Amino acid sequence: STGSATTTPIDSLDDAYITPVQIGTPAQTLNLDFDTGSSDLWVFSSETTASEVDGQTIYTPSKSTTAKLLSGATWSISYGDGSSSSGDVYTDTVSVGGLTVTGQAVESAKKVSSSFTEDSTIDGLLGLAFSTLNTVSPTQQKTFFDNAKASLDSPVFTADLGYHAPGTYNFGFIDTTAYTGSITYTAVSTKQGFWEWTSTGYAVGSGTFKSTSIDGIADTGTTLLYLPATVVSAYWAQVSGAKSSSSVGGYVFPCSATLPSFTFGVGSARIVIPGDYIDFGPISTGSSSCFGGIQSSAGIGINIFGDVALKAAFVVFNGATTPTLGFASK
């Protein structure tokens, strides 16, 4: 089997992407944030504290003839940005772009943090990291991909995120029309539960390539590109007036600037992030100070190839017995 679904930016900055997901019978369609940096599929629901729902579409398990309470199971997750959610668990039928999994764990939120409430466009998350990170207790549950894998034509999914435009998540096949040149594959460590890999270096603008190993994760659920302070300083030094602002929480730059591109290495191959992808707009409405899309990972504890990086590429998440990651230009 295969599946193919369009993923759409939630706002004009590409802060996140939503993908429609069918849950239950009859289908309840919710727009979920596909997150290769976590492993829980959780939704706003009829069980979510009412004051914490503000415009989201909810899953109502009592209206699904295929929903079953997973007795005794609870979940609770905290994300790198400080947001969180928790609740109980149902199993139900879940379909993405024509690909159906029966008996998928659907984690129903009883509580969500303010960041989730305040984002009306995201109805939940669909985790695509390794199932070892799944938070369901006392019986850990599998991701949608893990459940689908054996049925797929090939044990892969691909992320093709757009810049200020829709893109595509495919399951079970590689669309050879969706990228240019070849896909370069690179090793993955699953030891921390992530799609963790090592970039071979970087360049800033038209500058020379610096060969250096940068361990990090391919994370569709993180907006920005978080890299070591040395790398980030080298980038922003090429932007007149750019500075790190403790009050704002990262590098800012004059909105009048033209940003240079940023290149990262995948083996001997190179992915070029255009300068415009690095612009996250005014720090507050009407400001002429703009927020940068490349930020320091210092004190995160890990480098994160988030959407800023991934959307410059066609990305293969290869879930073969030994997982790998592939990157192509597009």
CSV table of N, CA and C in Angstrom, one decimal, residues 1-98:
chain,number,residue,atom,x,y,z
A,1,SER,N,0.9,-1.2,0.0
A,1,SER,CA,0.0,0.0,0.0
A,1,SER,C,0.9,1.2,0.0
A,2,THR,N,0.2,2.4,-0.3
A,2,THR,CA,0.9,3.7,-0.2
A,2,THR,C,-0.1,4.7,0.3
A,3,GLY,N,0.4,5.9,0.7
A,3,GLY,CA,-0.5,7.0,1.0
A,3,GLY,C,0.2,8.3,0.5
A,4,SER,N,-0.6,9.3,0.2
A,4,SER,CA,0.0,10.6,-0.2
A,4,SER,C,-1.0,11.7,0.3
A,5,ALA,N,-0.5,12.6,1.1
A,5,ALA,CA,-1.3,13.7,1.6
A,5,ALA,C,-0.5,15.0,1.4
A,6,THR,N,-1.3,16.1,1.1
A,6,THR,CA,-0.8,17.4,1.1
A,6,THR,C,-0.6,18.0,2.4
A,7,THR,N,0.5,18.7,2.7
A,7,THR,CA,0.8,19.4,3.9
A,7,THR,C,0.8,20.9,3.6
A,8,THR,N,0.3,21.7,4.5
A,8,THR,CA,0.0,23.1,4.2
A,8,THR,C,0.5,24.0,5.4
A,9,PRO,N,1.3,25.0,5.0
A,9,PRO,CA,1.7,25.9,6.1
A,9,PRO,C,0.5,26.5,6.9
A,10,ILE,N,0.7,26.7,8.2
A,10,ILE,CA,-0.4,27.2,9.0
A,10,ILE,C,-0.5,28.7,8.9
A,11,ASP,N,0.5,29.4,8.5
A,11,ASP,CA,0.5,30.8,8.4
A,11,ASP,C,1.6,31.3,7.4
A,12,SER,N,1.7,32.6,7.2
A,12,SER,CA,2.5,33.2,6.2
A,12,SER,C,4.0,33.0,6.4
A,13,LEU,N,4.4,32.6,7.6
A,13,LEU,CA,5.8,32.4,8.0
A,13,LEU,C,6.3,30.9,7.9
A,14,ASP,N,5.4,30.0,7.5
A,14,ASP,CA,5.7,28.6,7.6
A,14,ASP,C,6.0,28.2,9.0
A,15,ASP,N,5.3,28.6,10.0
A,15,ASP,CA,5.7,28.3,11.4
A,15,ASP,C,5.5,26.8,11.7
A,16,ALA,N,4.5,26.2,11.0
A,16,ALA,CA,4.3,24.7,11.1
A,16,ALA,C,3.5,24.4,9.9
A,17,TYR,N,3.3,23.0,9.7
A,17,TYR,CA,2.6,22.5,8.6
A,17,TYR,C,1.5,21.6,9.1
A,18,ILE,N,0.3,21.6,8.5
A,18,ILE,CA,-0.8,20.7,8.9
A,18,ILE,C,-1.2,19.8,7.7
A,19,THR,N,-1.5,18.6,8.1
A,19,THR,CA,-1.9,17.5,7.1
A,19,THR,C,-3.2,16.9,7.6
A,20,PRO,N,-4.2,16.8,6.7
A,20,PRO,CA,-5.4,16.2,7.1
A,20,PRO,C,-5.3,14.7,7.4
A,21,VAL,N,-6.0,14.2,8.4
A,21,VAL,CA,-5.9,12.9,8.9
A,21,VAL,C,-7.3,12.4,9.2
A,22,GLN,N,-7.7,11.3,8.7
A,22,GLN,CA,-9.0,10.7,9.0
A,22,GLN,C,-9.0,9.8,10.2
A,23,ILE,N,-9.8,10.0,11.2
A,23,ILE,CA,-9.8,9.2,12.4
A,23,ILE,C,-11.2,8.7,12.6
A,24,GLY,N,-11.4,7.4,12.8
A,24,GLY,CA,-12.7,6.8,13.2
A,24,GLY,C,-13.6,6.5,12.1
A,25,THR,N,-14.8,6.0,12.5
A,25,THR,CA,-15.8,5.6,11.6
A,25,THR,C,-17.2,6.1,12.1
A,26,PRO,N,-17.9,7.0,11.3
A,26,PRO,CA,-17.4,7.6,10.1
A,26,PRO,C,-16.2,8.5,10.3
A,27,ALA,N,-15.5,8.8,9.3
A,27,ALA,CA,-14.2,9.6,9.4
A,27,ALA,C,-14.5,10.9,10.1
A,28,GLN,N,-13.6,11.3,11.0
A,28,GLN,CA,-13.5,12.6,11.6
A,28,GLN,C,-12.1,13.1,11.1
A,29,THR,N,-12.1,14.2,10.3
A,29,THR,CA,-10.9,14.7,9.7
A,29,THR,C,-10.4,15.8,10.6
A,30,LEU,N,-9.1,15.6,11.1
A,30,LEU,CA,-8.4,16.6,11.9
A,30,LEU,C,-7.1,17.0,11.2
A,31,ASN,N,-6.7,18.2,11.4
A,31,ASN,CA,-5.5,18.7,10.7
A,31,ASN,C,-4.3,18.6,11.7
A,32,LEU,N,-3.4,17.6,11.5
A,32,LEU,CA,-2.4,17.3,12.4
A,32,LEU,C,-1.0,17.8,12.0
A,33,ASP,N,-0.2,18.1,12.9
A,33,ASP,CA,1.2,18.5,12.7
A,33,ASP,C,2.1,17.2,12.7
A,34,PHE,N,2.5,16.8,11.5
A,34,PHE,CA,3.4,15.6,11.4
A,34,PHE,C,4.8,16.0,11.9
A,35,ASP,N,5.2,15.2,12.9
A,35,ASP,CA,6.4,15.6,13.7
A,35,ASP,C,7.4,14.5,13.8
A,36,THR,N,8.4,14.5,12.9
A,36,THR,CA,9.5,13.5,13.0
A,36,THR,C,10.4,13.6,14.2
A,37,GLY,N,10.1,14.5,15.1
A,37,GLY,CA,10.9,14.6,16.3
A,37,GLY,C,10.1,14.1,17.6
A,38,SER,N,8.9,13.5,17.4
A,38,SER,CA,8.2,12.9,18.5
A,38,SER,C,7.4,11.7,18.0
A,39,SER,N,6.8,10.9,18.9
A,39,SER,CA,6.3,9.6,18.6
A,39,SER,C,4.9,9.3,19.1
A,40,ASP,N,4.2,10.4,19.4
A,40,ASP,CA,2.8,10.3,19.9
A,40,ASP,C,1.8,10.9,18.9
A,41,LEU,N,0.7,10.2,18.6
A,41,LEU,CA,-0.3,10.8,17.8
A,41,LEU,C,-1.4,11.2,18.8
A,42,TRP,N,-1.5,12.5,19.0
A,42,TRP,CA,-2.5,13.0,20.0
A,42,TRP,C,-3.4,14.1,19.4
A,43,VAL,N,-4.6,14.1,19.9
A,43,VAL,CA,-5.6,15.0,19.3
A,43,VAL,C,-6.4,15.8,20.4
A,44,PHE,N,-6.8,17.0,20.0
A,44,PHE,CA,-7.8,17.7,20.7
A,44,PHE,C,-9.1,16.8,20.6
A,45,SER,N,-9.9,16.8,21.7
A,45,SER,CA,-11.0,15.8,21.7
A,45,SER,C,-12.1,16.4,22.5
A,46,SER,N,-13.2,15.6,22.5
A,46,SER,CA,-14.3,15.9,23.4
A,46,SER,C,-14.0,15.8,24.9
A,47,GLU,N,-12.8,15.2,25.2
A,47,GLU,CA,-12.4,15.1,26.6
A,47,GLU,C,-11.5,16.3,27.0
A,48,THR,N,-11.1,17.1,26.0
A,48,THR,CA,-10.2,18.2,26.4
A,48,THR,C,-10.9,19.3,27.2
A,49,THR,N,-10.3,19.6,28.3
A,49,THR,CA,-10.8,20.7,29.2
A,49,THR,C,-11.3,21.9,28.3
A,50,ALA,N,-12.6,22.2,28.5
A,50,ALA,CA,-13.3,23.1,27.6
A,50,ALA,C,-12.6,24.5,27.4
A,51,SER,N,-12.1,25.0,28.5
A,51,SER,CA,-11.4,26.3,28.4
A,51,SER,C,-10.1,26.3,27.7
A,52,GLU,N,-9.6,25.1,27.3
A,52,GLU,CA,-8.3,24.9,26.6
A,52,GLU,C,-8.5,24.6,25.2
A,53,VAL,N,-9.8,24.6,24.7
A,53,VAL,CA,-10.1,24.5,23.3
A,53,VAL,C,-10.6,25.9,22.8
A,54,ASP,N,-9.9,26.3,21.7
A,54,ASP,CA,-10.2,27.6,21.1
A,54,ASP,C,-10.1,27.5,19.6
A,55,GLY,N,-11.1,26.9,19.0
A,55,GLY,CA,-11.2,26.9,17.5
A,55,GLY,C,-10.7,25.6,16.9
A,56,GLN,N,-10.1,24.7,17.6
A,56,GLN,CA,-9.6,23.4,17.0
A,56,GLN,C,-10.8,22.5,16.7
A,57,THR,N,-10.6,21.7,15.7
A,57,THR,CA,-11.5,20.6,15.5
A,57,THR,C,-11.2,19.4,16.4
A,58,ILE,N,-12.2,18.8,17.1
A,58,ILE,CA,-12.0,17.8,18.1
A,58,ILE,C,-12.4,16.4,17.5
A,59,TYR,N,-11.7,15.4,18.0
A,59,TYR,CA,-12.1,14.0,17.9
A,59,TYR,C,-13.0,13.6,19.0
A,60,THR,N,-14.2,13.0,18.6
A,60,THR,CA,-15.2,12.6,19.6
A,60,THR,C,-15.2,11.1,19.5
A,61,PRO,N,-14.5,10.3,20.4
A,61,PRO,CA,-14.5,8.9,20.2
A,61,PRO,C,-15.9,8.2,20.3
A,62,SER,N,-16.8,8.8,21.1
A,62,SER,CA,-18.1,8.2,21.3
A,62,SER,C,-18.9,8.2,20.0
A,63,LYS,N,-18.5,9.0,19.0
A,63,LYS,CA,-19.2,9.0,17.7
A,63,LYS,C,-18.5,8.1,16.7
A,64,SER,N,-17.5,7.4,17.1
A,64,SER,CA,-16.7,6.5,16.2
A,64,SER,C,-17.1,5.1,16.6
A,65,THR,N,-17.6,4.3,15.6
A,65,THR,CA,-18.0,3.0,15.9
A,65,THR,C,-16.8,2.0,16.0
A,66,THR,N,-15.7,2.5,15.6
A,66,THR,CA,-14.5,1.7,15.7
A,66,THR,C,-13.5,2.1,16.8
A,67,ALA,N,-13.9,3.1,17.6
A,67,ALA,CA,-13.1,3.5,18.7
A,67,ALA,C,-13.2,2.6,19.9
A,68,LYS,N,-12.1,2.3,20.5
A,68,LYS,CA,-12.1,1.5,21.8
A,68,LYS,C,-11.2,2.1,22.8
A,69,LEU,N,-11.6,2.3,24.0
A,69,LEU,CA,-10.8,2.8,25.0
A,69,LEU,C,-9.7,1.8,25.3
A,70,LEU,N,-8.4,2.3,25.4
A,70,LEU,CA,-7.3,1.4,25.7
A,70,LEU,C,-7.2,1.5,27.2
A,71,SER,N,-7.7,0.5,27.9
A,71,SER,CA,-8.0,0.5,29.3
A,71,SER,C,-6.8,0.7,30.1
A,72,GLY,N,-6.8,1.8,31.0
A,72,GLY,CA,-5.7,2.0,31.9
A,72,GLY,C,-4.6,2.9,31.3
A,73,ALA,N,-4.6,3.1,30.0
A,73,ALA,CA,-3.5,3.8,29.4
A,73,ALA,C,-3.6,5.3,29.5
A,74,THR,N,-2.5,5.9,29.8
A,74,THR,CA,-2.4,7.4,29.9
A,74,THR,C,-1.2,7.8,29.1
A,75,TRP,N,-1.1,9.1,28.8
A,75,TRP,CA,0.0,9.7,28.1
A,75,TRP,C,0.3,11.1,28.6
A,76,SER,N,1.5,11.6,28.5
A,76,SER,CA,1.9,12.9,28.9
A,76,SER,C,3.2,13.2,28.2
A,77,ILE,N,3.3,14.4,27.5
A,77,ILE,CA,4.4,14.7,26.7
A,77,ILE,C,4.8,16.2,26.9
A,78,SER,N,6.1,16.5,26.9
A,78,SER,CA,6.6,17.8,26.9
A,78,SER,C,7.5,18.0,25.7
A,79,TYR,N,7.4,19.1,25.0
A,79,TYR,CA,8.1,19.3,23.8
A,79,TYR,C,9.3,20.3,24.1
A,80,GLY,N,10.2,20.4,23.2
A,80,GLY,CA,11.4,21.2,23.3
A,80,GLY,C,11.1,22.7,23.5
A,81,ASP,N,9.9,23.1,23.0
A,81,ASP,CA,9.6,24.5,23.1
A,81,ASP,C,8.8,24.8,24.4
A,82,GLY,N,8.7,23.8,25.3
A,82,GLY,CA,8.1,24.0,26.6
A,82,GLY,C,6.6,23.7,26.6
A,83,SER,N,6.0,23.4,25.5
A,83,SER,CA,4.6,23.1,25.4
A,83,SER,C,4.4,21.7,25.9
A,84,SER,N,3.2,21.3,26.2
A,84,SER,CA,2.9,20.0,26.7
A,84,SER,C,1.4,19.6,26.6
A,85,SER,N,1.1,18.3,26.7
A,85,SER,CA,-0.3,17.9,26.7
A,85,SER,C,-0.3,16.5,27.3
A,86,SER,N,-1.5,16.0,27.7
A,86,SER,CA,-1.7,14.7,28.4
A,86,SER,C,-3.1,14.3,28.3
A,87,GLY,N,-3.3,13.0,28.5
A,87,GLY,CA,-4.7,12.5,28.5
A,87,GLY,C,-4.7,11.0,28.6
A,88,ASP,N,-5.8,10.4,27.9
A,88,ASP,CA,-6.0,9.0,27.9
A,88,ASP,C,-5.9,8.5,26.4
A,89,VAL,N,-6.2,7.2,26.2
A,89,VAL,CA,-5.9,6.6,24.9
A,89,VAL,C,-7.0,5.8,24.3
A,90,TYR,N,-7.3,5.9,23.0
A,90,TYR,CA,-8.2,5.0,22.3
A,90,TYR,C,-7.4,4.3,21.2
A,91,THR,N,-7.9,3.2,20.8
A,91,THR,CA,-7.5,2.7,19.5
A,91,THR,C,-8.6,3.0,18.5
A,92,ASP,N,-8.2,3.3,17.3
A,92,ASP,CA,-9.2,3.6,16.2
A,92,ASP,C,-8.5,3.4,14.9
A,93,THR,N,-9.3,3.5,13.8
A,93,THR,CA,-8.9,3.5,12.5
A,93,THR,C,-8.4,4.9,12.0
A,94,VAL,N,-7.2,5.0,11.5
A,94,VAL,CA,-6.6,6.2,11.1
A,94,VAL,C,-6.1,6.1,9.7
A,95,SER,N,-6.4,7.1,8.9
A,95,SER,CA,-6.0,7.1,7.5
A,95,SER,C,-5.3,8.4,7.1
A,96,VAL,N,-4.2,8.3,6.4
A,96,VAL,CA,-3.5,9.4,5.9
A,96,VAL,C,-3.3,9.3,4.4
A,97,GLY,N,-4.0,10.2,3.6
A,97,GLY,CA,-3.8,10.2,2.2
A,97,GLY,C,-4.1,8.9,1.5
A,98,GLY,N,-5.1,8.1,2.0
A,98,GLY,CA,-5.5,6.9,1.4
A,98,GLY,C,-4.8,5.6,2.1
